Amino acid sequence: MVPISPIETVPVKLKPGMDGPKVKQWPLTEEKIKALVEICTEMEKEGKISKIGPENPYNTPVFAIKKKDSTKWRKLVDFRELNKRTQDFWEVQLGIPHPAGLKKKKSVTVLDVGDAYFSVPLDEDFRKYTAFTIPSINNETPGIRYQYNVLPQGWKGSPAIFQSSMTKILEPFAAQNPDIVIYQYMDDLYVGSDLEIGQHRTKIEELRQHLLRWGLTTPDKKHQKEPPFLWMGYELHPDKWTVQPIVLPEKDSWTVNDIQKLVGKLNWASQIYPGIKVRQLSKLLRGTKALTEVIPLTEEAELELAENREILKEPVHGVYYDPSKDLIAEIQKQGQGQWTYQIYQEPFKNLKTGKYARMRGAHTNDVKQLTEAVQKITTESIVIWGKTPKFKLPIQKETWETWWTEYWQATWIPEWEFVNTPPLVKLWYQLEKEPIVGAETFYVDGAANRETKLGKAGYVTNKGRQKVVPLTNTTNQKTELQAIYLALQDSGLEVNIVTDSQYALGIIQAQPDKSESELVNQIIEQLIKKEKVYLAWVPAHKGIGGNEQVDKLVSA
């Protein structure tokens, strides 16, 4: 025989203070017991389990399940209880590669490593916790007791320890063969290269020979799986990728559940189909989670769906990444807080696409949303490609400069250029830095009675213009905004406005262009029509002329 290197065991512990499982074995039919005994005799012959004496106090239940449409039974050891008591492990598969970050490959071969799995020994000191019992025929002898010597299927640590054991075996091969890539998924190794097929097949044989150093055999009759690969919802081909087919159902009426499934499909599709939208369809899911409830589709939701069906009418593919080329990201505004983007290197050949939706919030504006979208694409790009794309944005350079130099927060967008494709992001209003000479001055105020919710809003001006409006079902905050609105309504194109409302100033200084408050929206529409507006704040109740008078008129 040829010596083989052992696979180093991973030391394993139970969580602190916990003991192993002691779970009752269910009674089984005479038929199932005979099947399990034969199954375990074979597993024992292969070294996977060993019989144990009666001292071991642990137990996990075992079942026999009929493999459908076959007379062959299959064994199932139910490790749910041991798994609760087993330590946590490092899970390497948490982040999965995105196809758009892969590199084109001339050949990709698959190798079955299912047999290696059972060359992976279980830590000797943990094996006792894996004990199980085949019940005896008629319960007239002790059940046969076994424990595992290898990683059990269904045990919490088996995926992480198998992957870490295979990676350690593979590392020297990969390091010394930088002209291939190797990826492990389930019981398969995928090996890709750009070598001419003869050299590529040579590397495969060399890999098989490396694996034999650990006694790991791979099937000669080469794998049936060949490009294209169905993997994690994608189709991988040698020189392009896409999502597996996206089929939106026809339906006469839609359930909560149906709409959740539809939105999930659209979201999946949006990584390569440009322009997908889900706002109106997601609006239908607001608040409710009665999975069987039917929701009428708004007209707006029907148009969104129809637009999506059209996008999905024929296949679209992405290209893979060429590290020798820059990455470009282009963004478009779609409306209703929705943004879409494409990432490419050569014109018209996207690596991937995607979308971004406005964050929930009271007030917002397009520049902030565009900035957030940029920040999201940047981070996604670092994950996939390790670098920030150059951005093509629908905002003039002068608009951005005006925005960031005057905005109260620090803000930044990385290297970008203007793309003149409507709709353009613009600043809808900008407040003055100084009081306006020659513009009338409006001193505004409002107040409300907390119990009756009656209030007043109004203004007085240096020209003697005055207004007070009685309001019902209102609050101090609302009346303070109503007063500013009235001043904007009744003033000329240039106006100075004096308020004592810290609330209103906080809103306006955030520079919204759209709000959940219809009063804020009305204020914004008035601001857009002005040529100049200066908003001045003063402290309340301090004897400030103008302010004192209007406060008196509105608190009456």
Partner 1 sequence: IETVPVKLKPGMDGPKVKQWPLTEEKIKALVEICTEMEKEGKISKIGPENPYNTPVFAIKKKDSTKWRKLVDFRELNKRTQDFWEVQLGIPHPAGLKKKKSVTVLDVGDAYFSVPLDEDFRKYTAFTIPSINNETPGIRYQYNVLPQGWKGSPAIFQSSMTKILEPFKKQNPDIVIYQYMDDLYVGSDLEIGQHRTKIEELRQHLLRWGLEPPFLWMGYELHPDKWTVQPIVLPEKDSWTVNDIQKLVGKLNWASQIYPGIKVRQLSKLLRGTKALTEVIPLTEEAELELAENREILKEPVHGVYYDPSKDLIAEIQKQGQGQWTYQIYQEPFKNLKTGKYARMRGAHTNDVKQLTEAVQKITTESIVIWGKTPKFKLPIQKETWETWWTEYWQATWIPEWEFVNTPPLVKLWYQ
Ligand X SMILES: OC1NC=Nc2cccc(F)c21
Ligand Y SMILES: Cc1cc(/C=C/C#N)cc(C)c1Nc1ccnc(Nc2ccc(C#N)cc2)n1
Binding residue ranges for Mg(2+): 112, 187-188, 445, 480, 500, 551
Cβ contacts of 34 within 8 Å, gap of 6 or more: 137
Q: Is 445 in the site for Mg ion (CB under 5 A)?
A: yes
Annotated binding site: 112, 187-188, 445, 480, 500, 551
**Cα–Cα distance measured from residue 268 to residue 352, given in angstroms and rounded to the nearest whole number:** 12
* Residue 97 engages ligand X in binding (rule: CB under 6 A): no
CB of 263 to ligand X, least distance (A): 9
DSSP code, position 141: S
User: Sign of torsion, CA 307 310 311 312?
Assistant: positive
Tokens in use for 427? Answer: 């600043």
Q: Return d(Cα 159, Cα 307) in angstroms, integer.
A: 42
Per-residue binder mask for ligand Y (CB under 6 A), 102-121, x = binder? xx-x--x-------------
CB of 185 to ligand Y, least distance (A): 5
Choice from 404, 416, 428, 429 touching partner 1 (CB under 8 A): 404
517 interacts with, out of ligand Y, partner 1, Mg ion, none, CB within 5 to 8 A per kind: none
From candidates 57, 315, 470, 545, binder to partner 1 by CB under 8 A = 545
The verdict on 264 binding ligand X (CB under 6 A) reads: yes
**Smallest separation, CB 324 to ligand Y (Å):** 15
Q: Max CA-CA distance within the chain? A: 108
| 80, 364, 533 from 479: Cα distances, Å | 60, 21, 20
The verdict on 405 binding partner 1 (CB under 8 A) reads: yes
- DSSP track, 284-307: TTSS---TT-EEPPPHHHHHHHHH
Rule CB under 6 A: say whether 200 interacts with ligand Y: no
Contact assessment for residue 366 and residue 340, using Cβ atoms and an 8 Å cutoff? no
Count the residues of the shown chain that bind partner 1, applying the rule CB under 8 A.
76
233 binds ligand X per the rule CB under 6 A:
yes
Question: Which of residues 74, 376, 514, 532 is near partner 1 by CB under 8 A?
Answer: 376
- The C-alpha atoms of residue 99 and residue 532 are separated, in whole angstroms, by 51
Nearer to partner 1, 348 or 408 (CB): 408
User: Strand (E) positions, 186-296?
Assistant: 188-193, 229-231, 234-236, 241-243, 254-255, 294-295
Cα–Cα distance measured from residue 55 to residue 145, given in angstroms and rounded to the nearest whole number: 10
223-262 binders of ligand Y (CB under 6 A): 227, 229, 231, 236-238
Determine if 412 is a binding residue for partner 1 (CB under 8 A): yes
**How many Cα atoms are found within 13 Å in the side-chain-facing hemisphere of 110?**
16
Distance CA 271, CA 246 (A): 12
100: its two tokens: 């758009």
Give the interface segment with ligand Y, choosing from 113-121, 181-189, 376-384, 481-489 (CB under 6 A). 181-189
DSSP 86: B
Told to check if 265 binds ligand X by CB under 6 A, we report: yes
Q: Which residue's CB is nearer to partner 1, number 76 or number 174?
A: 174
Site map (CB under 8 A) of partner 1, residues 39-58, x = contact = --------------------
418 binds, among Mg ion, ligand Y, ligand X, none (CB under 5 to 8 A by kind): none
The partner in contact with residue 233, picked from ligand X, partner 1, ligand Y, none with C-beta cut-offs of 5 to 8 angstroms by kind, is: ligand X
Place of tokens 């269910």: 26
Q: Count the Cβ atoms, other than its own, within 10 Å of residue 212.
A: 13
Which residues from 84-103 bind ligand Y, rule CB under 6 A?
A: 97, 102-103
Q: HSE of 183 in the Cβ direction (CA atoms, 13 Å)?
A: 13
Under the binding rule (CB under 5 A), the answer on residue 112 touching Mg ion is no
Minimum distance of Mg ion from residue 432's CB (angstroms): 24
Where residue 319 falls (left for φ over 0; alpha for ψ -120 to 50; beta otherwise) is beta
Binding site for Mg ion (CB under 5 A): 445, 540, 551
Binding site for ligand X (CB under 6 A): 233, 244, 264-265, 268
Binding site for ligand Y (CB under 6 A): 97, 102-103, 105, 108, 181, 183, 185, 190, 192, 227, 229, 231, 236-238
